[PDB]
Amino acid sequence: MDQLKTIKELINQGDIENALQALEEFLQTEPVGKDEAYYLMGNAYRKLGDWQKALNNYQSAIELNPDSPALQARKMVMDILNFYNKDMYNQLEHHHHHH
């Protein structure tokens, strides 16, 4: 069943640490369902405020399934980062760098 639901509940509550913990476990027991897991992981980090960890986890989901919502989610975070600063952004991707 959707055991991730419990994690999704934790993420909503703010219990991201336990969520991430269970997600780490889930990664090791799911060959394919990790794409939803990484999405949740990145979403958890995106709730914390760590955009870099969010990007990496969203990216990991994208790398598994380019059909996942993690694409739009990573772009969501990218938009917010683009609003903040490009100091580290130009290092990640030298693209969309317009002046």
The first five atom37 places (N, CA, C, CB, O) and aatype in JSON, in Angstrom:
{
  "aatype": [12, 3, 5, 10, 11, 16, 9, 11, 6, 10, 9, 2, 5, 7, 3, 9, 6, 2, 0, 10, 5, 0, 10, 6, 6, 13, 10, 5, 16, 6, 14, 19, 7, 11, 3, 6, 0, 18, 18, 10, 12, 7, 2, 0, 18, 1, 11, 10, 7, 3, 17, 5, 11, 0, 10, 2, 2, 18, 5, 15, 0, 9, 6, 10, 2, 14, 3, 15, 14, 0, 10, 5, 0, 1, 11, 12, 19, 12, 3, 9, 10, 2, 13, 18, 2, 11, 3, 12, 18, 2, 5, 10, 6, 8, 8, 8, 8, 8, 8],
  "atom_mask": [
    [1, 1, 1, 1, 1],
    [1, 1, 1, 1, 1],
    [1, 1, 1, 1, 1],
    [1, 1, 1, 1, 1],
    [1, 1, 1, 1, 1],
    [1, 1, 1, 1, 1],
    [1, 1, 1, 1, 1],
    [1, 1, 1, 1, 1],
    [1, 1, 1, 1, 1],
    [1, 1, 1, 1, 1],
    [1, 1, 1, 1, 1],
    [1, 1, 1, 1, 1],
    [1, 1, 1, 1, 1],
    [1, 1, 1, 0, 1],
    [1, 1, 1, 1, 1],
    [1, 1, 1, 1, 1],
    [1, 1, 1, 1, 1],
    [1, 1, 1, 1, 1],
    [1, 1, 1, 1, 1],
    [1, 1, 1, 1, 1],
    [1, 1, 1, 1, 1],
    [1, 1, 1, 1, 1],
    [1, 1, 1, 1, 1],
    [1, 1, 1, 1, 1],
    [1, 1, 1, 1, 1],
    [1, 1, 1, 1, 1],
    [1, 1, 1, 1, 1],
    [1, 1, 1, 1, 1],
    [1, 1, 1, 1, 1],
    [1, 1, 1, 1, 1],
    [1, 1, 1, 1, 1],
    [1, 1, 1, 1, 1],
    [1, 1, 1, 0, 1],
    [1, 1, 1, 1, 1],
    [1, 1, 1, 1, 1],
    [1, 1, 1, 1, 1],
    [1, 1, 1, 1, 1],
    [1, 1, 1, 1, 1],
    [1, 1, 1, 1, 1],
    [1, 1, 1, 1, 1],
    [1, 1, 1, 1, 1],
    [1, 1, 1, 0, 1],
    [1, 1, 1, 1, 1],
    [1, 1, 1, 1, 1],
    [1, 1, 1, 1, 1],
    [1, 1, 1, 1, 1],
    [1, 1, 1, 1, 1],
    [1, 1, 1, 1, 1],
    [1, 1, 1, 0, 1],
    [1, 1, 1, 1, 1],
    [1, 1, 1, 1, 1],
    [1, 1, 1, 1, 1],
    [1, 1, 1, 1, 1],
    [1, 1, 1, 1, 1],
    [1, 1, 1, 1, 1],
    [1, 1, 1, 1, 1],
    [1, 1, 1, 1, 1],
    [1, 1, 1, 1, 1],
    [1, 1, 1, 1, 1],
    [1, 1, 1, 1, 1],
    [1, 1, 1, 1, 1],
    [1, 1, 1, 1, 1],
    [1, 1, 1, 1, 1],
    [1, 1, 1, 1, 1],
    [1, 1, 1, 1, 1],
    [1, 1, 1, 1, 1],
    [1, 1, 1, 1, 1],
    [1, 1, 1, 1, 1],
    [1, 1, 1, 1, 1],
    [1, 1, 1, 1, 1],
    [1, 1, 1, 1, 1],
    [1, 1, 1, 1, 1],
    [1, 1, 1, 1, 1],
    [1, 1, 1, 1, 1],
    [1, 1, 1, 1, 1],
    [1, 1, 1, 1, 1],
    [1, 1, 1, 1, 1],
    [1, 1, 1, 1, 1],
    [1, 1, 1, 1, 1],
    [1, 1, 1, 1, 1],
    [1, 1, 1, 1, 1],
    [1, 1, 1, 1, 1],
    [1, 1, 1, 1, 1],
    [1, 1, 1, 1, 1],
    [1, 1, 1, 1, 1],
    [1, 1, 1, 1, 1],
    [1, 1, 1, 1, 1],
    [1, 1, 1, 1, 1],
    [1, 1, 1, 1, 1],
    [1, 1, 1, 1, 1],
    [1, 1, 1, 1, 1],
    [1, 1, 1, 1, 1],
    [1, 1, 1, 1, 1],
    [1, 1, 1, 1, 1],
    [1, 1, 1, 1, 1],
    [1, 1, 1, 1, 1],
    [1, 1, 1, 1, 1],
    [1, 1, 1, 1, 1],
    [1, 1, 1, 1, 1]
  ],
  "atom_positions": [
    [[0.85, -1.21, 0.0], [0.0, 0.0, 0.0], [0.88, 1.24, 0.0], [-0.96, 0.02, 1.24], [2.1, 1.14, -0.06]],
    [[0.25, 2.41, 0.07], [1.0, 3.67, 0.07], [1.51, 3.97, 1.48], [0.12, 4.83, -0.44], [0.88, 4.71, 2.24]],
    [[2.66, 3.4, 1.81], [3.27, 3.59, 3.12], [3.82, 5.0, 3.24], [4.38, 2.56, 3.37], [3.97, 5.55, 4.33]],
    [[4.11, 5.57, 2.08], [4.59, 6.94, 1.98], [3.57, 7.92, 2.55], [4.9, 7.28, 0.54], [3.93, 9.02, 2.97]],
    [[2.29, 7.52, 2.56], [1.23, 8.34, 3.14], [1.6, 8.8, 4.55], [-0.09, 7.56, 3.17], [1.4, 9.96, 4.9]],
    [[2.14, 7.88, 5.34], [2.58, 8.2, 6.7], [3.63, 9.3, 6.67], [3.13, 6.94, 7.39], [3.61, 10.23, 7.47]],
    [[4.55, 9.18, 5.72], [5.6, 10.16, 5.52], [5.02, 11.49, 5.05], [6.63, 9.64, 4.51], [5.43, 12.56, 5.51]],
    [[4.06, 11.41, 4.14], [3.36, 12.58, 3.64], [2.65, 13.31, 4.78], [2.35, 12.18, 2.55], [2.59, 14.54, 4.8]],
    [[2.12, 12.54, 5.72], [1.51, 13.1, 6.92], [2.55, 13.82, 7.77], [0.82, 12.0, 7.74], [2.32, 14.93, 8.25]],
    [[3.7, 13.17, 7.95], [4.79, 13.74, 8.74], [5.27, 15.05, 8.13], [5.96, 12.75, 8.84], [5.48, 16.04, 8.84]],
    [[5.45, 15.06, 6.81], [5.89, 16.25, 6.09], [4.91, 17.41, 6.3], [6.03, 15.94, 4.6], [5.34, 18.56, 6.46]],
    [[3.62, 17.12, 6.3], [2.6, 18.15, 6.52], [2.65, 18.67, 7.95], [1.21, 17.6, 6.2], [2.47, 19.86, 8.19]],
    [[2.88, 17.76, 8.89], [2.93, 18.13, 10.3], [4.15, 18.99, 10.62], [2.94, 16.87, 11.17], [4.13, 19.78, 11.56]],
    [[5.21, 18.82, 9.84], [6.46, 19.5, 10.12], [7.48, 18.54, 10.67], [0.0, 0.0, 0.0], [8.58, 18.93, 11.08]],
    [[7.12, 17.27, 10.68], [7.97, 16.21, 11.2], [8.83, 15.65, 10.07], [7.11, 15.09, 11.84], [8.93, 14.43, 9.88]],
    [[9.45, 16.56, 9.34], [10.25, 16.24, 8.16], [11.39, 15.27, 8.48], [10.81, 17.51, 7.56], [11.71, 14.41, 7.66]],
    [[11.99, 15.4, 9.65], [13.12, 14.55, 10.01], [12.73, 13.07, 10.04], [13.68, 14.96, 11.37], [13.47, 12.22, 9.54]],
    [[11.58, 12.77, 10.62], [11.08, 11.4, 10.65], [10.62, 10.98, 9.27], [9.93, 11.26, 11.66], [10.76, 9.82, 8.88]],
    [[10.07, 11.93, 8.53], [9.66, 11.7, 7.16], [10.86, 11.31, 6.3], [8.97, 12.94, 6.59], [10.84, 10.28, 5.63]],
    [[11.89, 12.14, 6.34], [13.12, 11.88, 5.6], [13.73, 10.55, 6.01], [14.13, 13.01, 5.83], [14.22, 9.8, 5.17]],
    [[13.68, 10.27, 7.31], [14.22, 9.04, 7.85], [13.54, 7.83, 7.21], [14.04, 9.0, 9.37], [14.21, 6.91, 6.73]],
    [[12.22, 7.84, 7.19], [11.44, 6.77, 6.6], [11.64, 6.71, 5.09], [9.96, 6.94, 6.93], [11.61, 5.64, 4.49]],
    [[11.83, 7.87, 4.49], [12.1, 7.96, 3.06], [13.43, 7.3, 2.71], [12.11, 9.43, 2.61], [13.53, 6.57, 1.73]],
    [[14.45, 7.56, 3.53], [15.75, 6.92, 3.38], [15.6, 5.4, 3.38], [16.71, 7.36, 4.5], [16.25, 4.7, 2.6]],
    [[14.74, 4.91, 4.27], [14.47, 3.48, 4.37], [13.74, 2.99, 3.12], [13.64, 3.17, 5.63], [14.07, 1.95, 2.56]],
    [[12.74, 3.76, 2.71], [11.91, 3.42, 1.56], [12.74, 3.3, 0.28], [10.82, 4.47, 1.37], [12.47, 2.45, -0.57]],
    [[13.76, 4.15, 0.16], [14.64, 4.13, -1.01], [15.28, 2.75, -1.18], [15.73, 5.2, -0.88], [15.54, 2.31, -2.3]],
    [[15.53, 2.09, -0.06], [16.26, 0.83, -0.06], [15.34, -0.37, -0.27], [17.03, 0.68, 1.24], [15.81, -1.49, -0.48]],
    [[14.03, -0.14, -0.21], [13.07, -1.24, -0.33], [12.18, -1.08, -1.57], [12.21, -1.31, 0.93], [11.27, -1.88, -1.79]],
    [[12.44, -0.06, -2.37], [11.66, 0.2, -3.56], [12.55, 0.52, -4.75], [10.68, 1.33, -3.31], [13.18, 1.58, -4.8]],
    [[12.59, -0.39, -5.71], [13.33, -0.23, -6.96], [12.83, 0.92, -7.84], [13.27, -1.51, -7.75], [13.62, 1.57, -8.52]],
    [[11.53, 1.16, -7.81], [10.92, 2.11, -8.74], [10.18, 3.24, -8.02], [9.97, 1.38, -9.67], [10.16, 4.37, -8.5]],
    [[9.58, 2.93, -6.88], [8.75, 3.9, -6.18], [9.55, 5.02, -5.53], [0.0, 0.0, 0.0], [8.99, 5.87, -4.85]],
    [[10.86, 5.01, -5.76], [11.73, 6.04, -5.21], [11.46, 7.39, -5.85], [13.18, 5.65, -5.4], [11.81, 8.43, -5.28]],
    [[10.86, 7.4, -7.03], [10.58, 8.65, -7.73], [9.56, 9.47, -6.94], [10.06, 8.37, -9.16], [9.67, 10.69, -6.86]],
    [[8.58, 8.78, -6.36], [7.62, 9.45, -5.49], [8.29, 9.81, -4.17], [6.39, 8.55, -5.25], [7.99, 10.85, -3.58]],
    [[9.19, 8.94, -3.72], [9.92, 9.17, -2.49], [10.79, 10.42, -2.58], [10.79, 7.96, -2.16], [10.71, 11.31, -1.73]],
    [[11.61, 10.5, -3.63], [12.49, 11.65, -3.83], [11.68, 12.94, -3.95], [13.35, 11.46, -5.09], [12.1, 14.0, -3.48]],
    [[10.51, 12.84, -4.58], [9.6, 13.97, -4.68], [9.21, 14.45, -3.28], [8.34, 13.59, -5.49], [9.24, 15.65, -2.99]],
    [[8.85, 13.5, -2.42], [8.48, 13.81, -1.05], [9.66, 14.37, -0.27], [7.93, 12.57, -0.35], [9.52, 15.32, 0.5]],
    [[10.83, 13.77, -0.48], [12.05, 14.22, 0.18], [12.35, 15.67, -0.18], [13.24, 13.32, -0.2], [12.56, 16.5, 0.7]],
    [[12.35, 15.96, -1.47], [12.57, 17.31, -1.93], [11.51, 18.27, -1.43], [0.0, 0.0, 0.0], [11.79, 19.42, -1.12]],
    [[10.27, 17.78, -1.35], [9.16, 18.59, -0.88], [9.33, 18.9, 0.61], [7.82, 17.87, -1.12], [8.99, 19.99, 1.07]],
    [[9.87, 17.94, 1.34], [10.16, 18.12, 2.76], [11.24, 19.18, 2.96], [10.61, 16.79, 3.38], [11.09, 20.07, 3.8]],
    [[12.31, 19.09, 2.18], [13.38, 20.09, 2.23], [12.86, 21.47, 1.81], [14.56, 19.67, 1.34], [13.24, 22.49, 2.38]],
    [[11.99, 21.48, 0.8], [11.38, 22.71, 0.33], [10.51, 23.35, 1.41], [10.55, 22.44, -0.93], [10.33, 24.57, 1.44]],
    [[9.96, 22.53, 2.3], [9.22, 23.03, 3.45], [10.17, 23.59, 4.51], [8.35, 21.92, 4.05], [9.84, 24.56, 5.2]],
    [[11.34, 22.97, 4.65], [12.33, 23.42, 5.62], [12.94, 24.75, 5.19], [13.44, 22.37, 5.78], [13.16, 25.64, 6.01]],
    [[13.19, 24.88, 3.9], [13.78, 26.09, 3.38], [15.1, 25.83, 2.69], [0.0, 0.0, 0.0], [15.67, 26.72, 2.06]],
    [[15.6, 24.6, 2.8], [16.83, 24.22, 2.11], [16.51, 23.88, 0.67], [17.52, 23.04, 2.82], [16.0, 22.79, 0.37]],
    [[16.81, 24.8, -0.22], [16.44, 24.67, -1.61], [17.39, 23.72, -2.34], [16.44, 26.03, -2.28], [16.97, 23.01, -3.25]],
    [[18.65, 23.72, -1.94], [19.66, 22.9, -2.59], [19.35, 21.41, -2.41], [21.06, 23.22, -2.03], [19.38, 20.65, -3.37]],
    [[19.04, 21.02, -1.18], [18.66, 19.64, -0.9], [17.37, 19.28, -1.63], [18.49, 19.43, 0.61], [17.2, 18.16, -2.09]],
    [[16.47, 20.25, -1.73], [15.22, 20.06, -2.46], [15.5, 19.81, -3.94], [14.31, 21.28, -2.29], [14.97, 18.87, -4.53]],
    [[16.34, 20.65, -4.52], [16.72, 20.53, -5.93], [17.32, 19.16, -6.22], [17.71, 21.63, -6.32], [16.93, 18.5, -7.18]],
    [[18.26, 18.75, -5.38], [18.95, 17.48, -5.57], [17.99, 16.31, -5.49], [20.05, 17.32, -4.52], [18.09, 15.36, -6.27]],
    [[17.04, 16.37, -4.56], [16.07, 15.29, -4.41], [15.06, 15.3, -5.54], [15.36, 15.4, -3.06], [14.68, 14.25, -6.05]],
    [[14.61, 16.49, -5.94], [13.73, 16.62, -7.1], [14.44, 16.09, -8.34], [13.3, 18.09, -7.31], [13.85, 15.36, -9.14]],
    [[15.71, 16.47, -8.49], [16.52, 16.02, -9.62], [16.6, 14.5, -9.65], [17.93, 16.63, -9.53], [16.48, 13.89, -10.71]],
    [[16.81, 13.9, -8.48], [16.9, 12.45, -8.37], [15.6, 11.78, -8.83], [17.22, 12.05, -6.93], [15.63, 10.72, -9.45]],
    [[14.47, 12.41, -8.53], [13.18, 11.91, -8.99], [13.04, 12.06, -10.5], [12.04, 12.64, -8.27], [12.56, 11.16, -11.18]],
    [[13.48, 13.21, -11.01], [13.47, 13.48, -12.44], [14.34, 12.48, -13.19], [13.96, 14.92, -12.72], [13.99, 12.02, -14.27]],
    [[15.48, 12.14, -12.6], [16.41, 11.21, -13.21], [15.82, 9.81, -13.29], [17.72, 11.18, -12.43], [16.13, 9.05, -14.22]],
    [[14.98, 9.45, -12.33], [14.29, 8.17, -12.37], [13.11, 8.24, -13.34], [13.8, 7.77, -10.96], [13.03, 7.45, -14.28]],
    [[12.22, 9.18, -13.1], [11.07, 9.38, -13.97], [10.96, 10.84, -14.37], [9.79, 8.91, -13.29], [10.6, 11.68, -13.54]],
    [[11.26, 11.16, -15.63], [11.07, 12.51, -16.17], [9.59, 12.84, -16.33], [11.79, 12.65, -17.52], [9.22, 13.93, -16.76]],
    [[8.75, 11.88, -15.97], [7.3, 12.03, -16.04], [6.74, 12.44, -14.68], [6.64, 10.72, -16.51], [5.55, 12.74, -14.55]],
    [[7.61, 12.46, -13.68], [7.21, 12.78, -12.32], [6.89, 14.28, -12.19], [8.3, 12.38, -11.32], [7.33, 15.07, -13.01]],
    [[6.13, 14.67, -11.15], [5.82, 16.08, -10.88], [7.03, 16.83, -10.35], [4.67, 16.18, -9.88], [6.97, 18.04, -10.13]],
    [[8.13, 16.11, -10.14], [9.34, 16.68, -9.57], [9.97, 17.7, -10.51], [10.34, 15.58, -9.24], [10.73, 18.56, -10.08]],
    [[9.66, 17.59, -11.8], [10.16, 18.54, -12.78], [9.6, 19.93, -12.49], [9.79, 18.1, -14.2], [10.34, 20.9, -12.39]],
    [[8.28, 20.0, -12.37], [7.61, 21.25, -12.1], [7.96, 21.74, -10.7], [6.08, 21.1, -12.25], [8.05, 22.95, -10.46]],
    [[8.16, 20.8, -9.8], [8.51, 21.11, -8.42], [9.91, 21.7, -8.32], [8.41, 19.85, -7.55], [10.14, 22.64, -7.56]],
    [[10.85, 21.16, -9.09], [12.22, 21.66, -9.09], [12.25, 23.05, -9.72], [13.16, 20.7, -9.85], [12.96, 23.94, -9.25]],
    [[11.48, 23.22, -10.78], [11.35, 24.52, -11.44], [10.68, 25.53, -10.52], [10.56, 24.38, -12.75], [10.98, 26.72, -10.56]],
    [[9.77, 25.04, -9.68], [9.12, 25.87, -8.67], [10.17, 26.46, -7.74], [8.07, 25.04, -7.87], [10.2, 27.66, -7.49]],
    [[11.03, 25.59, -7.22], [12.11, 26.0, -6.33], [13.11, 26.9, -7.07], [12.83, 24.77, -5.75], [13.61, 27.87, -6.51]],
    [[13.39, 26.55, -8.33], [14.29, 27.35, -9.16], [13.79, 28.78, -9.29], [14.43, 26.71, -10.55], [14.57, 29.72, -9.2]],
    [[12.49, 28.93, -9.51], [11.88, 30.25, -9.62], [12.12, 31.06, -8.35], [10.38, 30.13, -9.89], [12.47, 32.24, -8.41]],
    [[11.93, 30.42, -7.2], [12.13, 31.07, -5.92], [13.6, 31.44, -5.73], [11.65, 30.17, -4.77], [13.92, 32.54, -5.27]],
    [[14.49, 30.52, -6.09], [15.92, 30.77, -6.02], [16.34, 31.9, -6.95], [16.7, 29.5, -6.36], [17.18, 32.73, -6.61]],
    [[15.74, 31.92, -8.14], [16.0, 32.96, -9.12], [15.58, 34.32, -8.57], [15.26, 32.66, -10.44], [16.14, 35.36, -8.95]],
    [[14.6, 34.31, -7.68], [14.16, 35.52, -7.0], [15.18, 35.94, -5.94], [12.78, 35.31, -6.37], [15.4, 37.13, -5.71]],
    [[15.79, 34.96, -5.28], [16.77, 35.23, -4.23], [18.11, 35.68, -4.81], [16.97, 33.99, -3.37], [18.43, 36.87, -4.8]],
    [[18.89, 34.73, -5.32], [20.25, 35.02, -5.77], [20.72, 33.98, -6.78], [21.2, 35.07, -4.58], [20.21, 32.86, -6.81]],
    [[21.7, 34.35, -7.59], [22.22, 33.46, -8.62], [23.65, 33.05, -8.31], [22.14, 34.13, -9.99], [24.28, 32.33, -9.09]],
    [[24.16, 33.5, -7.17], [25.56, 33.26, -6.78], [25.92, 31.78, -6.84], [25.82, 33.79, -5.38], [27.0, 31.42, -7.3]],
    [[25.01, 30.93, -6.38], [25.24, 29.49, -6.43], [24.5, 28.88, -7.61], [24.78, 28.83, -5.11], [24.73, 27.73, -7.97]],
    [[23.61, 29.66, -8.22], [22.76, 29.18, -9.28], [23.54, 29.06, -10.58], [21.55, 30.1, -9.47], [23.36, 28.12, -11.35]],
    [[24.43, 30.02, -10.8], [25.28, 30.04, -11.99], [26.28, 28.89, -11.97], [26.01, 31.38, -12.11], [26.89, 28.56, -12.98]],
    [[26.43, 28.28, -10.8], [27.35, 27.16, -10.63], [26.63, 25.85, -10.95], [27.92, 27.13, -9.21], [27.22, 24.92, -11.5]],
    [[25.35, 25.8, -10.6], [24.53, 24.62, -10.87], [24.23, 24.53, -12.36], [23.23, 24.67, -10.06], [24.58, 23.55, -13.02]],
    [[23.58, 25.55, -12.87], [23.27, 25.63, -14.29], [23.55, 27.03, -14.81], [21.81, 25.24, -14.55], [23.0, 28.01, -14.31]],
    [[24.42, 27.11, -15.81], [24.81, 28.39, -16.4], [23.75, 28.84, -17.41], [26.2, 28.28, -17.07], [24.01, 29.7, -18.25]],
    [[22.58, 28.24, -17.32], [21.5, 28.52, -18.26], [20.45, 29.4, -17.59], [20.86, 27.22, -18.76], [20.37, 29.46, -16.37]],
    [[19.66, 30.09, -18.41], [18.64, 31.03, -17.92], [19.31, 32.24, -17.24], [17.68, 30.31, -16.93], [18.65, 33.02, -16.56]],
    [[20.61, 32.36, -17.43], [21.36, 33.49, -16.88], [21.23, 34.68, -17.82], [22.84, 33.11, -16.67], [22.06, 34.87, -18.71]],
    [[20.2, 35.48, -17.62], [19.95, 36.63, -18.47], [20.09, 37.91, -17.67], [18.56, 36.54, -19.12], [19.7, 37.97, -16.5]],
    [[20.65, 38.93, -18.3], [20.85, 40.22, -17.65], [20.11, 41.31, -18.41], [22.34, 40.55, -17.55], [20.15, 42.48, -18.02]]
  ]
}
